[PDB]
Symmetry: C3
Subunit: 116 residues, 3 copies
């Protein structure tokens, strides 16, 4: 199992969710965060005197997936979320020791396997 | 140490927090998130030492369950190091 | 890469952000959350991807900026990351 955390532009969210559902990746959660991506900074920011137009609203998606679905999930997000401009975001694939579905007590693979 | 990330229903949050406290699990953070239509959920993030992983997971499984689809999930993630900001040292 | 997750006091955020931009990280996100241990106390959660050579000094920069010496200062978690992709280019690493 892996926990996928993706940071994408708000204007790309709907395309991303549609692509994920199309890939059988249903269960997930999301929230708004402020972020700064790319490895760019304004001179004033690096000087520490300012931190204005450095942060922008992004959407953070958290998706638990079984091993077989890691590749399809990453590919769906990469295709849908890219604009080609700095600030597109990132995808972290995190190792997971255990997963539990609260309703059924199902664990690990069974807990993140597509309910359809 | 491990990092527990749990998604639960807002209506069950008080009960979950009460169970965690009864289990001696005190330090944690939480926030509202949108889950799965999208429905509001609460995401809890709890860093625990190894002996507290099980008690924490169980506290949440028992307090958060309603029996209806959408009760949530619990992830246990490996943590390489954890630092206590107050001391400037690992924990 | 490693994922640094820091929970800090809101009144220390400006200082921590300054330390992060001056340290140089390959991206960060942050948001307001509620801390506990009822009554919830505001905290700011920052998530920063940092590669191995620079994890220790980046953690030290955050520690120095965020510390007050009083209970409630927060914690910093360093998590392993299996893979990381840059969306702009699609590349892994």
């Amino acid at each position: 199992m892996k926990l996928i955390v993706a940071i994408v532009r708000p204007e790309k969210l709907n395309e991303v969710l549609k692509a994920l559902f199309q890939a059988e990746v249903r269960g997930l959660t999301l929230s708004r965060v402020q972020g700064h991506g790319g490895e760019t900074e304004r001179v004033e920011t690096y000087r520490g005197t300012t931190v204005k137009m450095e942060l922008h609203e992004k959407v953070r998606l958290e998706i638990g997936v079984s091993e077989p679905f890691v590749k399809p999930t990453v590919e769906a997000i990469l295709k849908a979320a890219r604009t080609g401009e700095v600030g597109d975001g990132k995808i972290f694939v995190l190792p997971v020791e255990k997963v539990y579905r609260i309703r059924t007590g199902e664990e690990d693979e069974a807990a993140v396997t597509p309910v359809q």
